[PDB]
Ligand binder design. Sequence first.
Ligand code: SF4
Ligand code: F3S
Length: 106
Amino acid sequence: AFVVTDNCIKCKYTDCVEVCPVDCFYEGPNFLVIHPDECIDCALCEPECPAQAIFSEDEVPEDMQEFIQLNAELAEVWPNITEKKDPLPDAEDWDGVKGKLQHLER
Ligand code: SF4
Ligand code: F3S
C-alpha cells in the first residue's frame, strides 16, 4: 500500500486521484486516504502529489507511522473519490506546515 500522510491535510489538491488505476482514494473534508486492500502499489500517484504527502508504506517517515493505520481506518468510512477537483482555498498557505493532524476533520 501507498499511504497519504500529514501534508495533504488542509491542502487536498486531489491531483493524485487522476493517475490511480484502481480508484482507491477516499475523500474526507480536508484530507484523502488510500484504501490498503485496493491499492496495487503501482506508485503512479506519488510523483503527482504537489504536497509530496504520499509514501510507500515501507517508506513512511518514523514520526508519521500513525498515518498507515489512519488511512486504513478512514478508507472504511469515507466515500470513494474518482475525479479531481479544485484544491482547498488556502492550500498553499498550509503546504509544508507541520503537525497538521490536529486539524484533521472526520
Ligand atoms: S500506489 Fe497506484 S493503485 Fe495505489 S493508490 Fe497510488 S495511484 Fe492508486
Ligand atoms: S495533497 Fe492530498 S489530495 Fe492527493 S494530491 Fe496530494 S495526497
